[PDB]
Amino acid sequence: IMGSSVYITVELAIAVLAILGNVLVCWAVWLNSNLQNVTNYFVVSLAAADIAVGVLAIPFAITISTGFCAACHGCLFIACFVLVLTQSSIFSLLAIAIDRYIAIRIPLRYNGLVTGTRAKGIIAICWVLSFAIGLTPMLGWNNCGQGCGEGQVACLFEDVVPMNYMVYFNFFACVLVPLLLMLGVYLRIFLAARRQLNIFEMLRIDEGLRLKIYKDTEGYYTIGIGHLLTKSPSLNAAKSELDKAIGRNTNGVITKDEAEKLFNQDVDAAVRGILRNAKLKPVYDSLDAVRRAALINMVFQMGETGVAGFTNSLRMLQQKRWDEAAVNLAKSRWYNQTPNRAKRVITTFRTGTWDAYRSTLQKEVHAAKSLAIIVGLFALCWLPLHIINCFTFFCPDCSHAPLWLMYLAIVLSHTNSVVNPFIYAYRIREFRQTFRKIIRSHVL
Ligand SMILES: CCNC(=O)[C@H]1O[C@@H](n2cnc3c(NCC(c4ccccc4)c4ccccc4)nc(C(=O)NCCNC(=O)NC4CCN(c5ccccn5)CC4)nc32)[C@H](O)[C@@H]1O
């Protein structure tokens, strides 16, 4: 079997899978309303980039390898488009990555930051950037300012696209940097996923963390986790009290480190409050650190009068009757009014461990494994090819990778540029379910 014949065959087999698989992803997002959030706007956008990679880029990439005599600029144009379209995937994959970072690590600012308007804008930015970079060769940086006769060359990627372009501008800027950002995103999600738990993380999950001043339920300026600054209607008075509490000019913004110093002051304040209260003091003294955190949690929610309202349930906690206490607390107005928060706090009371709060993280251990898969593929599929280029460009004298290896590298580059949404999308239950619903219907 001819080598070239095996290349064209595998490459078109990829072309089709790309089309079929990614249509599938856009189909799912079209039916299921519950899939029509903003993340999936980035997913579809990649879906689409990848469809054009399958329908256009791959056929042009094949052409580029046959070496027929073409007008240099005609063959430059074909070459450029494959660069544009593969470029679009990479960046579009990166928007997906950055979308996830914000959704997992700064979830209280995600809506008012990645809205539908901005998403569509960011997609414009990706596509415009792809053209800018991929069309650069045509604006002059190319291999034919000065066999086949005059004006024509053998149509092969390396005959029209300069190797210094591909290494210095394209590799370093359009593969290495995107990859490196994706790596940092993965790692930072991972550290969030597997974070150590304590009273600070506990209340962040229940109340949120703000690093910037916001007006509250009833118009009062606040910061961190639940920290009232002033009742005064002035942002300027608010920031002034913030500076006095922190110890520098904030301009209304703090660090996570600093909001922990605040939270701890508020905790000390709740403990002092509890110690003065004769209905709570004994219950608090009898408990262990983690159940103490549960008791303090209720207080931050209801104040101390309210917590002292649970006479029966407080009694049972003092007598160490955990299951009997849990059931008692679950009958309240508190449970019915805010059930998620209460069930987590009641489990904490039942167990003396952080389990209820740990489970809240399993959805981001999920997200981190996904990013890991994407980034690992991405490195696998894009590096051999660009590493091959660098060796050719820096060390032209030295031993070559053999033909089948160099060509496999291209095949790999195009596999990632197609099967990327699908893996991300396949690992989500809501997608996986919709896939099944089409497959056992419109197909059959
Ligand atoms: C977002 C970024 N986008 C991309 O990276 C996309 O752009 C395309 N691309 C990116 N570098 C590409 C690239 N490097 C050129 C590289 C090479 C060649 C073949 C396979 C992989 C890499 C090369 C290395 C060394 C010398 C010249 C080119 N060759 C092609 C592309 O068609 N080659 C196929 C067509 N040529 C050829 O058979 N020449 C032959 C190969 C064997 N000979 C050798 C070998 C060693 C030394 C001298 N002579 C004679 C020339 N395509 C590329 C590819 O589709 C990527 O997905």
UniProtKB/Swiss-Prot annotation:
Domain of life, source organism: Eukaryota
Keyword set for this entry?
A: Cell membrane, Disulfide bond, G-protein coupled receptor, Glycoprotein, Membrane, Receptor, Transducer, Transmembrane, Transmembrane helix, Ubl conjugation
- Membrane topology qualifier: Multi-pass membrane protein
Extracellular compartment segments: 1-5, 65-75, 142-162, 395-402
**Localization (cell):** Cell membrane
Reported modifications of this chain? Ubiquitinated. Deubiquitinated by USP4; leading to stabilization and expression at the cell surface.
Respond yes or no to whether keyword Glycoprotein is given for this record: yes
Give me the Cytoplasmic side stretches, as residue ranges: 31-40, 99-118, 188-370
User: Which one of the record's GO molecular function terms can you name?
Assistant: lipid binding
Listed as disulfide-bonded, the cysteine pairs are: C69-C148, C72-C144, C75-C155, C395-C398
Q: What is its main location?
A: membrane
Q: What biological processes does GO assign it?
A: adenylate cyclase-activating G protein-coupled receptor signaling pathway; adenylate cyclase-modulating G protein-coupled receptor signaling pathway; apoptotic process; apoptotic signaling pathway; astrocyte activation; blood circulation; blood coagulation; cell-cell signaling
Which stretches are transmembrane? 6-30, 41-64, 76-98, 119-141, 163-187, 371-394, 403-426
Write down any Gene Ontology CC term. plasma membrane
Amino acids binding adenosine: E158, N389, S413, H414
Self-association and partners: Interacts (via cytoplasmic C-terminal domain) with USP4; the interaction is direct. May interact with DRD4. Interacts with NECAB2. Interacts (via cytoplasmic C-terminal domain) with GAS2L2; interaction enhances receptor-mediated adenylyl cyclase activity.
> What does UniProt say about this protein's domains?
The cytoplasmic C-terminal domain is necessary for targeting the non-ubiquitinated form of this protein to the cell surface.
Described purpose of this protein according to its UniProt entry:
Receptor for adenosine. The activity of this receptor is mediated by G proteins which activate adenylyl cyclase.
Q: So what family is this one in?
A: Belongs to the G-protein coupled receptor 1 family.
Q: What is this protein called?
A: Adenosine receptor A2a
Q: Which organism is it from?
A: Homo sapiens
